[PDB]
Ligand binder design. Structure first.
Ligand SMILES: Cc1cc2nc3c(=O)[nH]c(=O)nc-3n(C[C@H](O)[C@H](O)[C@H](O)COP(=O)(O)OP(=O)(O)OC[C@H]3O[C@@H](n4cnc5c(N)ncnc54)[C@H](O)[C@@H]3O)c2cc1C
Ligand SMILES: Cc1cc2nc3c(=O)[nH]c(=O)nc-3n(C[C@H](O)[C@H](O)[C@H](O)COP(=O)(O)OP(=O)(O)OC[C@H]3O[C@@H](n4cnc5c(N)ncnc54)[C@H](O)[C@@H]3O)c2cc1C
Ligand SMILES: COc1cc(CCCO)cc(OC)c1O
Ligand SMILES: COc1cc(CCCO)cc(OC)c1O
Lengths: 524, 523
């Protein structure tokens, strides 16, 4: 029977009774079958590495406060999910093996308010991108969401891991405006203009008076968020999504050097531009066995056959334009003239391409217009038992940097028998190299290779000045370990704050490599 | 002047230890040298906020050592960059008696500008003028975002979450990475700068775990020694325009037309401002020129102000950016929308140039990142004129603007203070920025101004309008309005302050956050 680390069987028994006393017997789950459902679907070490001793589903903020006070009395570590779809990063599994999961989304799933004219929502953690989309379509249709690739996730949960989508509102944390958060001893506070009783401005300026705290509750174990505002973009009168195929893997250098100047003023590249490699593109519409059934990495001719058969390039650029059709045509004209400088470049609009090769173009057209999709999950049919882990370091948006990363990562992936399926994304002045490391979750050796590969990718990226932005449970200590300027000054700052707000070491111990005193230097 | 809590023995032992670190010239204890760090616009008592000394560290290592000395002897340390926080206490400490750490005197270098990626890494003493002058010479494709006055700190203004009026108007938003000395002397870099050998410190504001930079703004949790800022690309062309609105009551329609044109960042591309007659009369004239009588300005003078200077009651200023054809299209939309208001008159920076055009021409500068000091003319409105900021946040809704206009000017009249005010829409929030002008040399004027501002803050709060930035004298009251859940936000701030600052050293009472040794002792 899974016990939290540092808690007696007796104290665990007492805590479970006390948790039932608050939420209801139905909303305290300890059965193996219910716990298996909170397994990381894509484990990278074993699979037994990150387990839940129980799952607690509180009704409301008041119950969140009382379960936190119960956790403090008995020393129960509690991890936190909204919808727990953090796939690539641990799913709903706790960093600290044996933690009790607080499932905020199961019962706290309400859209609390939507203001059409001032363009915001006040949300609970269980609101999915699908939910909010449905609500806006029915009640505030001038507005649109910003969704990541999948959209079964939480508008709150994603923003709290500082996730992103691809509309002009792609930076989810940026557009987060106000929070209600239960602090680690069970106090509740509202951030920004929400701290003023009867304020009408909670969701329209992120800051308020005095120190601005919301960031400290993102990629964080300093609190359980119970309500979160997010600004919502107005739908433009029209939109158009385009694909640019590029023949040569060596085109990346020129593609990135043209992309930056076109994106840094947020026009003409109006949304978040993505450059996807042939694999990430082929894997939505095809399986690995279709191109190659031998051992070792995919050979060049397998790649070449994907390019030809699907009508794609090694690099496939996807962008959306917004506004009156006269502006779209004009901006698209600047785009075509700029990227057309690259020999072999081919341009296709969402209304010009409707074949196997255009599946991603059509899916990008939905996502870039805030229409949530599960199409990218077909990527997990690439190989049997496929799972993925995320690798997404930050770089300067310069071709030389891109080329360096492309080469470093692919070379290592080839060595570790993992396909190079990646994309380069430019936000405004920063670049992300997002590689989806795919592997057989059911094959212990493949799990071990993926973990070994990712640890190597992180160290080598970091030696080059490229820091990881978001990572898996299994990798959090190592990633925080790379941010060790001032003999680990950042982590010492985080620990000082954690130990002050959380003297009993309760909330999601080890999140972002931040351990409270009672668990740190115990190797878990 | 001694710091509260400290014996003279400990003070002199620290002053000595300060001297060993920074050198004799950069520890100032003369009442002549201290006089220049006085709040120039004191509210209530003019002796309420005094410095016991001013220390100018050379570098991060010296800031750290002076912080360690402070911790040894229990010396409170307040902090400036350029200390031009005029309307908010200037370079005067919240805790009377504190030793001011003057980061800007010697730490004044532009450390790095990247033209292609559009950022600077700055030390605190870099002024808007400095950075403008640097860019024109070495990175001319780039422009600063500056506030109304250029003599302030790019860093210090960002750390109080100050603003300008270009698309980069939210200075904290564009702040990207910082190096901070924590209250006990440890130094740390935020975001990507926490990775040694990082090439992306100024390219993304957030690093890997919890995002901390916000907690160093309107804050006493540390001394910033380096700050990054994103820098906007100069568009190919620009033009600034002025819409004059005849009626007081037009405010409601102006704000309701303003919001839908600003929320998408077009056609209102920059931060739109709506200044009242007094605000842009007070630049280019003195109150004496219009009324010598007693009590409030009667309606006749506002009118003679309007007619003599060709201004409205409400004066809209905006800038448009891009190729001329985009400028003209955007200007056509703005004319078509605000032109629905009768008495609407539209003029560009190219087609006015008269005495009443002084503010339009100054906005053309500020909105194109040319800094200026022309708005200081304002402080000649009356002899010995000072101002205190009042700037609550409201929904950008005409009804809310009219309620705020009425309730602020009614109380301003009662307390014998002119209504000189701006409505500003950021993106989906409105600021009511009132400049309460008073005779700094008159104890009654100073007392009345404090009384007026206290009442304005309480009535604003009762209406659901919170203050965003305020004077030393008002910080306790303003934090007290943010008291959701029995003072939960201040209790959180106190727990963090006590954890990072166990000896209660850095800028005690900033934003109403007092460390344990000083809390609830009435200053
Ligand atoms: C093929 C593929 C594509 C993907 N594409 C994207 C993409 O485009 N963009 C993207 O951002 N992600 C992407 N992901 C990752 C993932 O699908 C999303 O980020 C997803 O939205 C995150 O899960 P969630 O929304 O359920 O959040 P959750 O799992 O509920 O929460 C995320 C984390 O936030 C914290 N947390 C959650 N709720 C609370 C709370 N109430 N209080 C405090 N802390 C809390 C915890 O640290 C938790 O682990 C992708 C994954 C895969 C496999
Ligand atoms: C007529 C008039 C018009 C104005 N217009 C504007 C305007 O348009 N926009 C605007 O934003 N302001 C405006 N102001 C207010 C003020 O002039 C500016 O905000 C000015 O830039 C702030 O002073 P400073 O830059 O010297 O900052 P400083 O006074 O150096 O610092 C400001 C505050 O930040 C903190 N701080 C400073 N340095 C550090 C450090 N190194 N570490 C930690 N904390 C630190 C302290 O709390 C300090 O009091 C106006 C004032 C007047 C009188
Ligand atoms: C924007 O952030 C992410 C994007 C993807 C898309 C992967 C290629 O489609 C996956 C992630 O994590 C696994 C992300 O965090
Ligand atoms: C945008 O923020 C401010 C603007 C002004 C200009 C006032 C009218 O021109 C003064 C301030 O402080 C007194 C501000 O904070």
């Amino acid at each position: 029977r899974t016990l939290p680390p540092g808690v007696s069987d007796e104290d665990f028994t007492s805590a479970l009774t006390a948790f039932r006393d608050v939420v209801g017997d139905e909303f305290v789950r300890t059965d193996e079958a219910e716990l298996a459902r909170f397994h990381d679907p894509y484990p990278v070490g074993d699979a037994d590495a990150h387990l839940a001793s129980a799952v607690i589903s509180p009704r409301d903020t008041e119950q969140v406060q009382e379960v936190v006070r119960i956790a403090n009395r008995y020393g129960i570590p509690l991890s936190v999910i909204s919808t727990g779809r953090n796939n690539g990063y641990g799913g709903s599994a706790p960093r600290l093996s044996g933690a009790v999961v607080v499932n905020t989304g199961e019962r706290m799933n309400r859209i609390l308010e939507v203001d059409e004219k001032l363009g915001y929502a006040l949300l609970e953690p269980g609101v999915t991108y699908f939910d909010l989309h449905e609500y806006l379509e029915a009640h505030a249709p001038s507005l649109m969401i910003d969704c990541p690739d999948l959209g079964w996730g939480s508008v709150v949960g994603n923003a709290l891991d500082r996730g992103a989508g691809y509309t002009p509102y792609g930076d989810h944390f940026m557009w987060q405006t106000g929070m209600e958060v239960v602090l680690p001893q069970g106090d509740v506070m509202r951030t920004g203009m929400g701290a003023l009783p009867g304020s009408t401005t909670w969701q329209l300026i992120p800051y308020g008076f005095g120190p601005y705290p919301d960031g400290m509750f993102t990629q964080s174990n300093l609190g359980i968020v119970t309500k979160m505002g997010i600004a919502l973009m107005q739908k433009p009168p029209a939109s158009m999504t385009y694909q640019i195929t590029f023949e040569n893997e060596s085109d990346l250098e020129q593609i990135v050097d043209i992309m930056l100047p076109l994106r840094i003023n947020m026009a003409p590249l109006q949304n978040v531009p993505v450059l996807r490699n042939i694999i990430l593109d082929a894997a939505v519409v095809s399986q690995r066995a279709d191109w190659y059934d031998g051992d070792g990495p995919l050979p060049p001719e397998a790649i070449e056959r994907m390019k030809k058969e699907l009508g794609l390039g090694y690099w496939n650029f996807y962008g959306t334009l917004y506004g009156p059709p006269q502006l779209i045509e004009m901006n698209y004209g600047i785009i075509k003239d700029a990227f057309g400088q690259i020999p072999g470049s081919r341009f296709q609009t969402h209304e010009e391409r409707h074949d196997r090769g255009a599946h991603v173009l059509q899916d990008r057209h939905k996502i870039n217009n805030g229409i949530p999709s599960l199409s990218e999950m077909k990527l997990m049919d690439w190989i049997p038992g496929a799972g993925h882990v995320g690798f997404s370091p930050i770089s300067p948006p310069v071709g030389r940097d891109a080329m360096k990363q492309f080469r470093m990562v692919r070379s290592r992936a080839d060595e570790y028998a993992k396909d190079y399926a990646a994309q380069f994304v430019v936000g405004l002045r920063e670049m992300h190299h997002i590689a989806l490391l795919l592997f057989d979750t059911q094959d212990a050796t493949a799990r071990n290779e993926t973990l070994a590969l990712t640890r190597l990718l992180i160290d080598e990226a970091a030696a080059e000045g490229y820091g990881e932005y978001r990572t898996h449970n299994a990798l959090m200590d190592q990633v925080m370990g790379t941010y060790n300027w001032g003999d680990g000054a950042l982590l010492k700052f985080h620990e000082a704050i954690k130990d002050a707000l959380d003297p009993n070491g309760i909330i999601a111990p080890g999140k972002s490599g931040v351990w409270p005193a009672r668990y740190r230097g115990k190797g878990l």
